[PDB]
Design a protein around this ligand. Structure first.
Ligand code: HEM
Ligand code: HEM
Ligand code: M46
Ligand code: M46
Ligand code: H4B
Ligand code: H4B
Ligand code: ZN
Lengths: 407, 411
């Protein structure tokens, strides 16, 4: 019932009670652990609204006040009559911040309470969404001094009128198959790149072509828009000691900004809610560059370093991997674009867990995602037991819209 | 119920039906996942079902299910339980058992090898001296002058829980740790406590950085006895680096035989509390964990110093750089002395092929991702991208409490 987590490097033991407030289900049972699976009405809504409002008013130390009981009645009335309800600004801000706070896969959560929330609930068209998105991108980029933010479009009503950003992130690079049969650019976005072309985009057909935005308002068909290049901050990737590294021709974008998730607050569903923070180096250098199914450049780099690629046991992949990641961090830091390394991020998160254990009674954490994709055991999160559970408000995945949409 | 796992790099999808034969519990529920928690005497009552399930599995594996020999064995075990309260395994069922425990070990990346296990039956053993003899033979056979062979030695099973056989060491070969008055540690910090127990039982400690510990062996619930493993039987490898000549001057070595001696083997409800087993090392066990854990030898700083890396900011990745070099060294050293070792790329690739084969022939392969993924360079190994289902089959290896917290001293 009251659960303990131990750090095996420091012997620090924390007691978890926040898990008892968990509501949603994990995928696991007493017979099977699903910890490494990537994705495991009016009557329905009031309990949801109540649970959310009760936590809001406790958070502002007004649990059981006239103000609390009055709001519970006001939303109860609004549901009974309208079948949905509207969040107050203050509740919206709190909800969004708490969706990040409860994101068990996110190592960056020490920052959860500095999140700039942009209320785009008055938006009605794709051109509108475009305008809101450009303002978000420019505000968050802050000329390389990056600031966290979320922009919240209108909530689902009857699911026939959804707002969606079809892009998986606001800024991503294009991918094209070839008659060759190999792949130019980013192979993860091949299908989305086709949908854009198939919608009308004129692809330059390069390695690092910033994709166009595809925005859907009110369940209408979505529309293309180019983000002004001047708003897309990019970093050329060089190495502090390998001169030839610059000649590989690599760059990445400064602003990580996920746009295909659904934000759930007090039972209400916000299907378009792009948010952004800043990169941990490994996301670009380990995953983007070195995944077999991504830019997959390890082979090409190890060659330039003249390492022995005859045997896996020379650890030539490993050697190359480190150098790529030293380069990513170096380039960003040199150009003054915020980035965090995996050592500093994981250390922060250990302190965040401490803070949340004492102030909140726990911190849901998914170990499989929190431990970085390189050098796991030399980061302190490797040795830290974590309990994973689902709290609300939350971010959730949702199906890619082209499987759902009705044209 | 059929359950799919997807490899996200290859798009290979596999279907698990084997999870249906799982009886024991995970620690998890529908509301909490305990997948990163390190650790989440029987009556006639609970024993014949466990026996029967074990023998239905054994008899299916040999294609004799429902034969007269299957039924007669069931009847014979039943009578022996209700007459004597326990029962004895046949040699063949013991071999099958020990192998399936390995095969079912969800945290083991080296399971491709499960069916090549040399089983030594030590169930006639009665004294600590007899245990020492058995363990020596295990170590010489397994070592095989550097061409390592997998093996397990099985001492008598638990009876009333008051006559247990235990190996007090956590591995058959492991180095001392000594806490100094100034708070520093000499040798391996992981073994301080155990080193302290040996001292007190009368071991005269050389007190160096790499002193092979003595065996502390308990037979028949008796007080443990100290033995020294003959040094000529302890194969060791000095660590050097193929390019950095100063690496040898760090003074490092390691032993070649990894041999876990503190787990409990369960087969058809029987509990073997002393069942030391051994394979060979994956390089990262020594290079990443044994040398570079902060709570272990912790040589990262000294290695980075000698490489004159930039140690003023973690963003130089000086730690990551030092770690790869140390691991290269470990692998070069073992290979140069012709001692079996496997790198993490080779081992994880093998495992993915094992896992696939197991889904085809067995209908599943339980696997613990937190443990299967190597502790360096995770995402450039294919296991990182592999979805896995973790569940508990029997026979199985299990943890047990350290014997010094439970033993009743005789004096
Ligand atoms: C401020 C800097 C931030 C850092 C360094 C950071 C770091 C990370 C990292 C490394 C991951 C794993 C991503 C992957 O491997 O695909 C992650 C996942 C996640 N982060 Fe954060 N994050 C940050 C800000 C945010 C903010 C502002 C939000 C929300 C407001 C957020 C919500 C999430 C969610 C929902 C996931 C997992 C989504 C999924 O399950 O696919 N992150 N983050
Ligand atoms: C033949 C070469 C072998 C290799 C390379 C291999 C590799 C590994 C590695 C890397 C781990 C995780 C170790 C750690 O990080 O602490 C492991 C765990 C395990 N292995 Fe294997 N193994 C091998 C043979 C065996 C044998 C012969 C047995 C039993 C007969 C076995 C049973 C297990 C068990 C029970 C664990 C989990 C221990 C725990 O939960 O603490 N291994 N093995
Ligand atoms: N630096 C940051 C900041 C915020 C982030 C917020 C979210 C994310 C992760 C976005 N990942 C979604 C894609 C993961 C996925 C899941 C299932 C299947 C699949 F193909 C891909 C990364 C972040 N990085
Ligand atoms: N190369 C091999 C072969 C067989 C192996 C068999 C088992 C093992 C792991 C042995 N570790 C036992 C203790 C793990 C543990 C659990 C809880 C707390 C703790 F500090 C350590 C490693 C192996 N390596
Ligand atoms: C199969 C496994 O769940 C999958 O590869 C996961 C593992 N851990 C991860 N961890 C992070 N941070 N990001 C990811 O995409 C993944 N992918
Ligand atoms: C807390 C966490 O589960 C623990 O540190 C685990 C993580 N994964 C591991 N994986 C292996 N192979 N060996 C280990 O000791 C550990 N330690
Ligand atoms: Zn689980």
């Amino acid at each position: 019932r009251f659960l303990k987590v131990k750090n095996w490097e420091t012997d620090v033991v924390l007691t978890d009670t926040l898990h008892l407030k968990s509501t949603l289900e994990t995928g696991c049972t007493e017979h099977i652990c699903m910890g490494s699976i990537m994705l495991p009405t009016k009557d329905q809504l009031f309990p949801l609204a109540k649970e959310f409002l009760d936590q809001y008013y406790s958070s502002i130390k007004r649990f059981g006040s006239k103000a609390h009981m009055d709001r519970l009645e006001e939303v109860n009335k609004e549901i009974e009559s309208t079948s949905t309800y509207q969040l107050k600004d203050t509740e919206l801000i709190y909800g969004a911040k708490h969706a990040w706070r409860n994101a068990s896969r996110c190592v960056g959560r020490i920052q959860w309470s500095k999140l700039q929330v942009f209320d785009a609930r008055d938006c009605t068209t794709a051109h509108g969404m475009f305008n809101y998105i450009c303002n978000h991108v420019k505000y968050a980029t802050n000329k390389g001094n990056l600031r966290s933010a979320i922009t919240i479009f209108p909530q689902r009503t009857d699911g026939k009128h959804d707002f969606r950003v079809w892009n998986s992130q606001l800024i991503r690079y294009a991918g094209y198959k070839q008659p060759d049969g190999s792949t130019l650019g980013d192979p993860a976005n091949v299908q989305f790149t086709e949908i854009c072309i198939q919608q009308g985009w004129k692809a330059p057909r390069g390695r690092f072509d910033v994709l166009p935005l595809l925005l859907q308002a009110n369940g209408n068909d979505p529309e293309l828009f180019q983000i002004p290049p001047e708003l897309v901050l990019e970093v050329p990737i060089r190495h502090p000691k390998f001169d030839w590294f610059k000649d590989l021709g690599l760059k990445w974008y400064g602003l990580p900004a996920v746009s295909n998730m659904l934000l759930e607050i007090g039972g209400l569903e916000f299907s378009a809610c792009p948010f952004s923070g800043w990169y941990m180096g490994t996301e670009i250098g380990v995953r983007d560059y070195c995944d077999n199914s991504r830019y997959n450049i390890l082979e090409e780099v190890a060659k330039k370093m003249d390492l022995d690629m005859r045997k896996t046991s020379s650890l030539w992949k490993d050697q190359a991997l480190v150098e790529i990641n030293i380069a990513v961090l170096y380039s960003f830091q040199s150009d003054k674009v915020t980035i965090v390394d995996h050592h500093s991020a994981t250390e922060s998160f250990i302190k965040h867990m401490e803070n949340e254990y004492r102030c909140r009674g726990g911190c849901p954490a998914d170990w499989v995602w929190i431990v970085p994709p390189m050098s796991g055991s030399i980061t302190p999160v490797f040795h830290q037991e974590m309990l994973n559970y689902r709290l609300t408000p939350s971010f959730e995945y949702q199906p890619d819209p082209w499987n759902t949409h009705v044209w």
